[PDB]
């Protein structure tokens, strides 16, 4: 097998900034990994193209993946509202990091997060299950747009996405 | 503080 690679295309204020790819670990949390990769190609009539990162924290990480409320109360998984937390196999060891955002335990829906650092206090809470394999400078670029608090300062939208890989 | 939570964005 090989781990599924999967883009986004990002947008600032309409504007496209540039491509992100991701490697899906999917010898490591299959469902978790297949879950993202559905979401981003949009083969089962819903998921990320189109959809914004609602809040990003400098040195922290970005948020996204609500395309039904867009505030972070939204989003779904493949397998229906939430899924369990597969396994806590990987950690959040540096930047490039994507888990899974949740409400406590077996919540996982369709919102995840990119870490921008090293965020070791998530470990065995949320599930990580990729990592960026190019375009880390355009999530550097996107962080410049956040703030302490999350709020961002301009609309940054997935403007496309697929499977590479 | 730093969560990543999905609706009670916490401290």
């Known amino acids: 097998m090989v781990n599924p690679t999967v883009f986004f295309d990002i947008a600032v204020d309409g504007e496209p900034l540039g491509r992100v790819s991701f490697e899906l670990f999917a010898d490591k949390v299959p469902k978790t990994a297949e879950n993202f990769r559905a979401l981003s190609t949009g083969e089962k009539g819903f998921g990320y193209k189109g959809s914004c990162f609602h809040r990003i924290i400098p040195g922290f990480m970005c948020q996204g993946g609500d395309f039904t409320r867009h505030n972070g109360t939204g989003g779904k998984s493949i397998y229906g509202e939430k899924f369990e937390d597969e396994n806590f196999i990987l950690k959040h060891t540096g930047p490039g990091i994507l888990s899974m955002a949740n409400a406590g335990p077996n919540t996982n829906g369709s919102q995840f997060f990119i870490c921008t650092a090293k965020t070791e206090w998530l470990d065995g809470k949320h599930v990580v299950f990729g990592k960026v394999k190019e375009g880390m400078n355009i999530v550097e670029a996107m962080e410049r747009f956040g703030s302490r608090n999350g709020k961002t300062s301009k609309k940054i939208t997935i403007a496309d996405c697929g499977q590479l890989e | ?11």
């Open chain 2, 1 to 11: 503080x730093l969560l990543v939570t999905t609706g009670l964005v916490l401290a």
